[PDB]
Symmetry: D2
Subunit: 499 residues, 4 copies
């Protein structure tokens, strides 16, 4: 396993290359850390709640200029940012691996997501389409226009520490908004590097300095951002608890929220499923990112006629998964984020067996003496007699519960029964089963796929889910509309009014 | 003036209800009462639903939804078409009930029923659209699309002032979107809702549609609160005063539900030096005094350039003095009564406070013929010239009070428009091309509706209706407002038989 | 079988025309004749328009357009709503005329009239949409939008086989788009057009709309040609055989006009090894034999996997032998007559040539009860097994002939589908998820309509209807097909008071 | 004036820098030329009609691969092309000035149009939106999809020798089409440079070589392209004669055309017009590019109450226009393209005075001895008593006809009376007049603007016009739909059919 001194030097190098002034951000209030060894990297300055208020003030002042800057000019800034991200892709990806623990190929993919949404937002900057339409009034004209909203508060999580902010910031900036970003306390360095690169693009563009600001600190900092009367939109990604904080209190001040609170995602495996395809897809979606994606596969609903062979094949695969240092290309499963994540995983597996389940593979901590402060775990495969309490309540860990069904409508009911609703997949060769799964009475999730897993999503699609996932959408399609305000304009050019 | 008697109003209400298919014996009772602002009197008592009845109604609506959501949308549109035909057939009867319960003049009552018919026609068109998207995917041998699906039971909370059109907007759209509806009408206007529901129930019977597609729950606040709190109601659409917002918005958010909120406006019009004054005075009177100042879109603030402020006030003063106030069934009437005594009280307190904050009462504000209908509150709309936009101006009163403010620079007029906490509609009267465009620009008026040379009530079925800030953010009726009634799904379909292998490893 | 007599048909036609408001005395004459495929006989003579009359009709339609184009689209929609109500009222009468002139069975005639009603409902929705766009501009202090405007007079050329629905698609959409219409119906089906126009003229009178919004011109080819050549007709919508294409397309292009061309299809269905054979045989019979093979969307080629080809042919042979052929007014009839003797002649020549090109006639092809109605051509649909897709298979005959081809690899079936010069509709019958998606993929079926587990007539109001290659490229009815009836404008609005100075020089 | 030897060396340098192999393209069949001096630069190889057939075959073979290449991957090629255009912007702009004669600032702007449509097309590559919509059939699903069309024939003109092709090629390539480009015989070098840069992007992307090909030659080459049965779309830009060739014969083989055949564009000047704004706007739109834009202002319809002062101000401005070498930054008006252009201009002015008009300014050839083979002319200002034959028939030269009106509806009628219909503008301070001009009974053109001239257009808008302009649209909004084919798909998953 990579040494902590080596990791710290890599982090400082990447930060410096991305334009971070290490002397200016170091301090004693917070500590950067790495799940690779569990070690603290170095101390950081923190922001206070008054700092948040000052940051919102600076973002709002920037917004007053940015909102009348033509959207194609705002797109030119985002185009330049994408060029800088391309130039520093490896440096940023190193920070993503160091702080989030994800393997390098996934860290590079996450940085590429940033570049791709930049390119998409540059296209959007000439669109942001409203409508023109007839009016019933003679000698009048009617249209619908879209306008910049204001300061956007972005709350992101540890597991996608750069892509979620990029989704929000690339779209928000092209929409004429400004951004105040509160990253996860677990992943501040990625955010500092992102912000420094964007500040460089802002300088090159001659744009206002307050277009984007990062606030580093604990829960009190994020609370102050959520409560700000000058933040009309809060975009929050995290686990379910973040909804009951953020949603209601922003609603209480008549603000808007985009909430994406994770999922408890299932795939249905029908009798005609290609089992090699299904096993590969399930392994990648259940074990990838050590089960720490919003879209992670956590429930496999398998037809009773193939359930035994599917569990046998998955058991063999799970026993073969390469666990290790996420900087090694041979690794598929890196570490969990911290000790509490490991403890919660162990507690879920213990509860599952007490609720009648059978642990088929995985669950054991790997090479603890190689890094006693880090938690490398083999993903767990648990066969369950029913969708019990532990199955319905998501644990943010690599645990794949296997359930059986006979009738497709019951598989759909099992998919839909849980409180979350992010993504779902069906593996089938049957044309009708595929369509039934995607029909109005099929899977109820925001993402519903055929013959690809629960992480099957891309930039051009709206990303998000239903029920306790929170209802928000980000990235593609017309998700941008949540960052602007609609106006309906009637124009009288006839000189008369009804008497 | 001569005001209809309560007994004459009751007889007309009962005739209208019977013609619309309501069983008077079944809906009458002793728990609540129907009433009329025309005299302030109770008409007759009504049976009420309990909170338990609300839960039963929601569960029955959900059962109906389980069938309706797989009924093809064009077939769902056929039901709405049939309902529109019944509304057309009973337009006069329903308009009678709107005048009786809301107090609005006959022509406005007819226009509100026509709004229902028009949104039915619009929703029938939508029933073949409800467009999602197909789009490229980056993955070879895959397809990508976005689809829209029926959401579930929609709870509709409506207000006294548009007792049929708001529900119609929500129900016509929700039904073609595959949703079902539980409607809590205003405690002040139950009869209009009973008549609407009876006509829709006839359409449902004619169509062979599920019986639980729409239900009216008649009750007080505990009935409405139970509807808002139901875990089986994924969307609550609420129209009412600002206080409905902090109620409904956070509560529904707390259970991961969706809301559409339209909580009224404090709407302003800017009058520039080049304004056509005949056009402007007519538009301002209609928008300030119409519906006795009880529209969400009512004109409450007039922001007039200092060069023409004196002549505009003179003309408005004369016009307000000529307003015909009386029984809303008489064709001569332009201004009917306020809804109840509490509305009159709040109006008088606002006018008194405006004069204490430095304002000058230019016209109106007095109760008319109080002895002719002692329980009813007919008032002349008030015109108040204000030296600044003080607290009483920024706090909207649901009453016909028009505050006149002066400005010099257009950016000051825009700031005056935007400074209030509401944000429903705004208008600018100008002959100047650049001023009109500046008012509508991103740094212009901040409202959900922003118009040129038409007042703050200038809106129509085809546009999205709603506003910003404390108005609540929701949109109803036109454009793609229907998307709030459905859930988006993003679908990736793999037909390649292959998946990307993580780290190149094949686990098979 | 028992076939209605010409005199009984004429009496029913005259009753239907009178009920729809046609003045029989005014339209009768000696220039042309109405006829019926049920017996092949002339019904009665009609007055005809001259080419000069066409120019007069176009100029009158243009005068109407000058008023209609500034009539608000929702008001234009109200006219179309009224027309839909009259169509609903006279559905049976109009369907009688469709059966009499086109020869299609009662249920199909009723369905075609219902298509008219449905597109009216759709167009009423469109009348509040006709959406353009608003979008950012790169220029500070400017605004940018895209608007859609009424185009002008639309010339509609329709065919005998859908004598009312095609005009309805064009007219309902054109009218709400602010256009006016001059309609040249098939020389074979004038009475349906006279009845439609009389009902629309009543709607126009009820609405107080301009009288020249729609006119029917009754004539031969010189009347149609004058319409196509008119410099006052910016859009010609033409439905007919392939030969209508090289006529209309280039001529209208030569005067910088626009065309919508839908020139029929040579439509195929692929039957894969996993196809549900009961579903497939029923769908194939309905799509091949329905309307006596005289739909633009008729199934003419069946591309069947070699593993199931023998059993599919056996089942189709038995089904074709059981088809009930007879008078289309009898409820027992599924297959009515071909339109005329020339259609029968071309069918016999194609079947004879197919057997000479190596094919095997499996069922049908014979004229039924020739002595019962000697001037009418009732035929049993032909089923022909072909060893290859030879010339006669690639050249479509407007007759019920189903050619059966075999394949092994799906890419071969797709090539067989795509190899013909027409490109209207295609279908695949399969239980396999990947085959269904492959058929619809960019390298799949090349047609304008491509379906899974539904035949080649699987289309509906909400979709754009039309095809590719020699089908002609046009789209009608649903989605945003309406844009072909309007002109796009891109509007930049400067409110900044400034312009970019070329080379920085201020010439003022 | 720049010397021919200097110009030739600049052209060869720019070509080489853009990757052109000078030995491979030089020949004896055609000659490159420059309007700066009228001189021939050097000889070029030409293609034969069989070469066109071979090029179409190669483009079609490329199309069979490109049409299943995911559109976002096709967008990555266009993104790379835009980067190469940015890198070689000055080199390409030099070739545009040398061949088209336009001043360097306009040549740079035209190359920037290419870069901007590349960025827009990269956004489109994740959109290309069809629809999903309800079906009336129980247990069915309905959608509308868009598919690559095939080989696109592009015919461009001398006056925008790179931007028009870029509009067509960036959109076509993202739409999965391939391109065969026949540039103007007058401007082959720009096309060779564009094609070489795109071939470099294709090589970097690993894309098929036949995605884009240039065919250099005379009318027989373009005719063979237009007639090809494997070219389903022809996009043609040029003067009106190109419509009656291209439109009807492509229609005769059931192909599709996009036609943009220029304009006879007018601006209305109302009594409340800002006259400083109007004079500047009119001078730029009438005299820019020496009157050789499709969007050039050719008709000024001025209210009678201000007509005298507007003509006086325009006369003064026209007398002050800087005519000269388009490589000199002081130049506003460069040369006309060739002697025939000058002759046609002179003939139009002579006809205008015979039809009752008064030449107020301009029309004289400038410094002929400085370059006897080049035609530098001062733009002509002609006051006309009515919209006579010469006013209604466009001459591709800087001639601005001044007409008077009193009632706005008559100004609109004068605007609309001509056979072309590309662009129109109104200069007014009056809110109602502005809206009346843009209303359904207002200006009939494809582009209709307020307080900006007839060249007021940009990437995000659909570009094109009505009537004899030809009806086509290019560039923005959903112009891309003309490059693809619509499919309507009904999917039955219920297992049943109506009996
Ligand atoms: O305030 C208004 O103008 C309004 C409110 C609801 C429904 C219709 N109109
Ligand atoms: O061929 C068809 O199926 C068709 C043609 C025109 C109108 C309706 N249907
Ligand atoms: O005439 C114009 O302004 C034009 C023409 C083609 C491309 C860009 N601009």
């Amino acid at each position: 396993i990579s040494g902590t001194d080596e990791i710290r030097a890599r982090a400082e190098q990447a930060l410096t290359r991305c334009g971070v002034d290490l002397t200016a951000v170091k301090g004693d209030a917070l500590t950067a850390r790495t799940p690779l060894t569990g070690a603290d990297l170095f101390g950081l300055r923190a922001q206070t709640p008054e700092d948040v208020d000052r940051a919102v003030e600076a973002a709002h002042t920037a917004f007053l200029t940015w909102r009348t800057t033509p959207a194609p000019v705002r797109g030119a800034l985002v185009k330049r940012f994408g060029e800088l991200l391309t130039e520093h892709k490896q440096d940023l990806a190193d920070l993503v691996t160091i702080e989030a623990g994800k393997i390098r190929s996934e860290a590079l993919g996450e940085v590429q997501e940033m570049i791709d949404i930049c390119d998409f937002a540059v296209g959007l900057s000439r669109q942001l389409y409203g409508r023109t339409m007839p009016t019933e009034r003679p000698g009048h004209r009617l249209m619908e226009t879209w306008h910049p909203l204001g300061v956007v508060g972005v709350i992101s999580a540890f597991n996608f520490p750069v892509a979620v902010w990029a989704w929000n910031a690339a779209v928000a900036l092209v929409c004429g908004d400004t951004v105040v970003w509160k990253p996860s306390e677990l992943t501040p360095l990625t955010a500092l590097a992102c912000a420094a690169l964007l500040d460089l693009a802002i300088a090159d563009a001659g744009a206002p300095k307050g277009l984007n600001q990062v606030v580093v600190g604990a829960a009190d900092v994020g609370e102050r951002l959520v409560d700000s009367p000058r933040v009309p939109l809060v975009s929050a990604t995290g686990s379910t608890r973040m909804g009951r904080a953020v949603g209601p209190r922003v609603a209480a001040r008549f603000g808007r929220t985009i909430l994406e609170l994770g999922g408890n995602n299932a795939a249905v495996v029908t009798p005609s499923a290609d089992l090699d395809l299904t096993v590969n897809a399930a392994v990648f979606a259940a074990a990838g990112t050590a089960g720490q994606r919003c879209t992670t596969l956590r429930r496999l609903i398998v037809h009773e006629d193939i359930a035994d062979t599917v569990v046998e094949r998955l058991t063999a695969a799970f026993e073969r998964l390469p666990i290790g240092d996420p900087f090694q290309d041979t690794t598929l499963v890196g570490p969990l984020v911290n000790e509490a994540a490991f403890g919660r995983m162990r507690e879920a597996v213990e509860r599952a067996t007490a609720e009648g389940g059978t642990l088929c593979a995985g669950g054991e901590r790997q090479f603890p003496d190689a890094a006693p402060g880090a938690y490398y775990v083999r993903p767990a495969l648990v066969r369950m007699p029913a969708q019990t309490a532990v199955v319905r309540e998501e644990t943010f860990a690599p645990i794949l519960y296997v359930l059986t069904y006979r009738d497709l409508d019951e598989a759909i009911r099992l998919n839909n029964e849980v409180p979350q609703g992010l993504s779902a997949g069906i593996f089938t060769a049957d044309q009708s089963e595929a369509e039934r799964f995607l029909a109005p009475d099929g899977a109820d999730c925001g993402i519903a796929n055929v013959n690809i897993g629960t992480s099957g999503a891309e930039i051009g699609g709206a990303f998000g889910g239903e029920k306790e996932t929170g209802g928000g959408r980000e990235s593609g399609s017309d998700a941008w509309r949540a960052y602007m305000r609609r106006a309906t304009n009637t124009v009288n050019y006839s000189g008369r009014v009804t008497l």
